[PDB]
């Protein structure tokens, strides 16, 4: 059961590495807010962390300290994800830096989290509309409503401030009021329901979901227009060539790190295995070499970002 805990951390790490790998597939948008030297500082610090973690991975697999082994694996996985985000961000910056490249444009609204809120509010309201809805369900649905309506109104305020489209500016403000007003009206019915859980107050609360659903639905429809969505960067062939050394080095790091974790997973179960210790050393060196090439590639281009 203790080794099973270590194996599970390995499987979690491997899952995260495959997820973060997608950042390197086609960097046509920024990953975060980091500048170029921000990315470089990030990779350097994650290098120190990863180096320490990889020492802990081997040492604790050998000595059979499975709790410390799992922690070293998780630490390594986090550093590798940090590496990849910085590398993918730096590669994007390099690609769009090219004179014949065009940078991406972030949308007025984060695309899916708007549908996420719409769905969460729809299903919260669905619960409030059910004849069998219990008092605890009113409370849980109310927390869902409050969380996502607050987010929706914040996104409306921000989207309105960013857009140059006058119609969109007014619509986002109008939708924010519609959501705020309908939500407040629903919260009013919920408070009355709490003080007196009558059939009238139950029907009143149920009825108050409809104006909220309509507002959130009209808003989701309007905000899903492609005009308001992000535009991917158009990176020139020269930009692609320039960013490729960073990309392939980060890709090679993730691949070799996967082998290292898979090998360590087996060694945690049975460390008495000289062949696998050699395989682990092979993966470790390839991880280290990949990082070296990544830092080298990024340092080569650093003077152009001073």
């Amino acid at each position: 059961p203790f080794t099973k805990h270590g194996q599970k951390e390995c499987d979690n790490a491997l899952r995260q590495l495959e997820t973060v790998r997608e950042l390197l597939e086609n960097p046509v948008q920024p990953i975060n807010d980091m500048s170029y030297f921000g990315c470089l500082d990030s990779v350097m610090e994650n290098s120190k962390v990863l180096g320490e973690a990889m020492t802990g991975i081997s040492q604790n697999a050998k000595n059979g300290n499975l709790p410390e082994f799992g922690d070293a694996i998780a630490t390594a996985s986090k550093a590798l994800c940090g590496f990849t985000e910085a590398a993918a961000q730096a590669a994007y910056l390099v690609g769009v830096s090219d004179p014949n490249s065009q940078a991406g444009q972030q949308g007025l609204v984060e695309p899916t989290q708007f549908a996420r809120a719409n769905q969460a509010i729809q299903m919260a309201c669905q619960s409030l509309g059910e004849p069998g809805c219990t008092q605890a369900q009113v409370l849980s649905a109310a927390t869902i409503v409050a969380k996502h309506t607050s987010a929706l109104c914040n996104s409306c305020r921000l989207a309105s401030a960013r857009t140059a489209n006058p119609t969109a500016k007014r619509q986002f403000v109008q939708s924010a009021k519609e959501v705020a007003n309908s939500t407040a009206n629903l919260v009013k019915t919920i408070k009355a329901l709490d003080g007196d859980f009558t059939e009238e107050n139950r029907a009143q609360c149920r009825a108050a979901t409809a104006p909220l659903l309509e507002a959130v639905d009209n808003l989701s429809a309007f905000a899903s227009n492609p005009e308001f969505s992000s535009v991917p960067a158009q990176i020139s062939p020269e930009g692609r060539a320039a960013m490729e050394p960073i990309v392939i080095s980060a890709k090679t790091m993730l691949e070799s790190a996967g082998g290292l974790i898979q090998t360590a997973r087996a060694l945690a179960v049975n460390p008495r295995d000289p062949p696998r210790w050699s395989v682990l050393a092979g993966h470790s060196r390839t991880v280290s070499d990949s990082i070296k090439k990544l830092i080298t590639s990024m340092r080569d281009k650093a003077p152009g970002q001073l």
Partner: peptide, 17 residues
């Protein structure tokens, strides 16, 4: 009107990580 805003803020706190 203000008790509703207070209740709403309680609801948001209970449903936010």
């Amino acid at each position: 009107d203000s008790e509703i805003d207070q209740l709403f803020r309680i609801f948001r706190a209970l449903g936010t990580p």
